Amino acid sequence: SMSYTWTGALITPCVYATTSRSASLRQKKVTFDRLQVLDDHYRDVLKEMKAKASTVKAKLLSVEEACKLTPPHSARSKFGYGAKDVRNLSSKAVNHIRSVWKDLLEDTETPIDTTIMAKNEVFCVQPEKGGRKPARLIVFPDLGVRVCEKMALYDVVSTLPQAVMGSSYGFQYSPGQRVEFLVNAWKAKKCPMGFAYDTRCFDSTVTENDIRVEESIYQCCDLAPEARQAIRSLTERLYIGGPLTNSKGQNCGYRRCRASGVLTTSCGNTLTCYLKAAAACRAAKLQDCTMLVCGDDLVVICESAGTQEDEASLRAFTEAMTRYSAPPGDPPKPEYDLELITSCSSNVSVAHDASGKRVYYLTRDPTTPLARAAWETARHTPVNSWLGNIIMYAPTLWARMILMTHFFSILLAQEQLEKALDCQIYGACYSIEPLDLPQIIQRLHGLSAFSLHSYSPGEINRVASCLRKLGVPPLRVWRHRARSVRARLLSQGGRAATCGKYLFNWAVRTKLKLTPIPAASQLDLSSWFVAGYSGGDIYHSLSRARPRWFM
Ligand SMILES: O=C(O)/C=C/c1ccc(NC(=O)C2(NC(=O)c3ccc4c(C5CCCCC5)c5n(c4c3)CC(=O)Nc3ccccc3-5)CCCC2)cc1
Numbered sequence: 001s002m003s004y005t006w007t008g009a010l011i012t013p014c015v016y017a018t019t020s021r022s023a024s025l026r027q028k029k030v031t032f033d034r035l036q037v038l039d040d041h042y043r044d045v046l047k048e049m050k051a052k053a054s055t056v057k058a059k060l061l062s063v064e065e066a067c068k069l070t071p072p073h074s075a076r077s078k079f080g081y082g083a084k085d086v087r088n089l090s091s092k093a094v095n096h097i098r099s100v101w102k103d104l105l106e107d108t109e110t111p112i113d114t115t116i117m118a119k120n121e122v123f124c125v126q127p128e129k130g131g132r133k134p135a136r137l138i139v140f141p142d143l144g145v146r147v148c149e150k151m152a153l154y155d156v157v158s159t160l161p162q163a164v165m166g167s168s169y170g171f172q173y174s175p176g177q178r179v180e181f182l183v184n185a186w187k188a189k190k191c192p193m194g195f196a197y198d199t200r201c202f203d204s205t206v207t208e209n210d211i212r213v214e215e216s217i218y219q220c221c222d223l224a225p226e227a228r229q230a231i232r233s234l235t236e237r238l239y240i241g242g243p244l245t246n247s248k249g250q251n252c253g254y255r256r257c258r259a260s261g262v263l264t265t266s267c268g269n270t271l272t273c274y275l276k277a278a279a280a281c282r283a284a285k286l287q288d289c290t291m292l293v294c295g296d297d298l299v300v301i302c303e304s305a306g307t308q309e310d311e312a313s314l315r316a317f318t319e320a321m322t323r324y325s326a327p328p329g330d331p332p333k334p335e336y337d338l339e340l341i342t343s344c345s346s347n348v349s350v351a352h353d354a355s356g357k358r359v360y361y362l363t364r365d366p367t368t369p370l371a372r373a374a375w376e377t378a379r380h381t382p383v384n385s386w387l388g389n390i391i392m393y394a395p396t397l398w399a400r401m402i403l404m405t406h407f408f409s410i411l412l413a414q415e416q417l418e419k420a421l422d423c424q425i426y427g428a429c430y431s432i433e434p435l436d437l438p439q440i441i442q443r444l445h446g447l448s449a450f451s452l453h454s455y456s457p458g459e460i461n462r463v464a465s466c467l468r469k470l471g472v473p474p475l476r477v478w479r480h481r482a483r484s485v486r487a488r489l490l491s492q493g494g495r496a497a498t499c500g501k502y503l504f505n506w507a508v509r510t511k512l513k514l515t516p517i518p519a520a521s522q523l524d525l526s527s528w529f530v531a532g533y534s535g536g537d538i539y540h541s542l543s544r545a546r547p548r549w550f551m
């Protein structure tokens, strides 16, 4: 069947930001008929995945628990209430949610309406290789249905992927745990070879059968009967397909592929990618495979069979993936150094700590993070990508010297250090105070993140070249700026002084010996690095348990 069908009504609006003007270019790429052919390897991997899914017990969330997961700025319902009414448990919001729930239990077939919109994302236009990227498309159901998805499946999508895929499930790892996983897998091989597999338009390649197979895995959970019915109904009425409405309420067409804005998008994509890849590893006869899967992002680390054999085994892997309806965007390439593998737009790099010991960390090309940060300092945005980049890339030369320095000078000037800001981590929205960054960083990356040095020449050159290309002042200017920012933070005491001392320890002549922050252990990071929720409409406010009067 066609991934999409269009009436011709426009997908209307809600260095460069992607807009609805380029929607038709995206529409052409994502629209095609899928041909899928399954074999014994696919069926064998599925049964192995289902036997692991069988150990899961999932709970039904109450209306109140599902309401508390709704982001404050989540799109309002077309039925007379918004995200604020949902979070306050208003009678109208609650009544509508309960009637949506009852309808899921009673109607097993009527397709559920979804809205289609062009995503507005900021990218950097490099006129050296190609042109501007067209806008990605987001498909999501009404707020009432989104609350019902949480009741039925929040616990499933938060627990099942790790039970099924084990150590291969990428969203269970903090950045440092991800690096540790890749380094350990790489070290385990006699002669390692690794590759990234990029599927072309993954969401469009997801067939009706893929979506039913994904439900067959969910149905292996111990579930309340109403959760079992809601999952069955949601599969047939929403997850397999349905009609598309634009922002103006006009009929845009229909979808028979993965919706990008549903609670099961990340979990479904991860299970589907893992299934197809593990089966393709068997068809290609790759030896001692270790996989790392995050949605449609796949990394494979295996035992090398020789340079020519590896190229042939990769073409065999690609042929199997293509039969399973996961054709490649860029053809995969074997790599023989772990640092050369780009996965989830990141690569492993190495630095030294204050005692000269090697420390592995995750980094990336800083062009898109700096360009998005420039857009965010220019205009008020709903999500602060600079904040998520500081958190996730805290050990990097660029996040430390440029992002920390720039945003802490802005927060000092606006006197907004204590103001909680929204940022996205693995698709979920987190409300975080910048004053909590040293404790967050210590927990996610270790105390060494504040003392890294001896960065590689390749990493230093990539950062310096990026600054020149974007017209950003050189690294020496950032050191001078950080010294002043640090001095002002220290004078304020409490958490603000800790930002100065820890975040900007790199900027001082004679480096201070840093001891662990005692209040760091109090931060409740239990919802962090458990699962992926991209497009799942998930929110959490950062909480602190068992505080001490003097901390
Ligand atoms: O050789 C030497 O000894 C010294 C050289 C030297 C060169 C340039 C400066 N620039 C500045 O002082 C100003 N801009 C900046 O001090 C500046 C700060 C951050 C900048 C950023 C981002 C960096 C990441 C956080 C968000 C801000 C961008 N651009 C920046 C410029 C350059 C710019 O204007 N825009 C973009 C566009 C895309 C990407 C990045 C940028 C402020 C007043 C005059 C212009 C200072 C010193």
Ligand SMILES: O=C(O)CNC(=O)c1ccc(OCc2ccc(Cl)cc2)c(NC(=O)c2ccccc2)c1
Pocket: 174, 175, 176, 178, 265, 266, 267, 269, 294, 295, 296, 297, 344, 346, 362, 363, 388, 389, 392, 393, 424, 425, 426, 427, 532, 533, 534
């Ligand atoms: O499931 C889906 O369908 C869509 N996929 C995702 O949602 C998705 C998959 C893997 C990801 O990253 C993994 C990673 C990267 C760097 C580091 Cl240091 C560690 C791990 C991210 N990235 C972030 O969330 C992010 C936010 C802010 C800053 C940096 C990364 C998103």
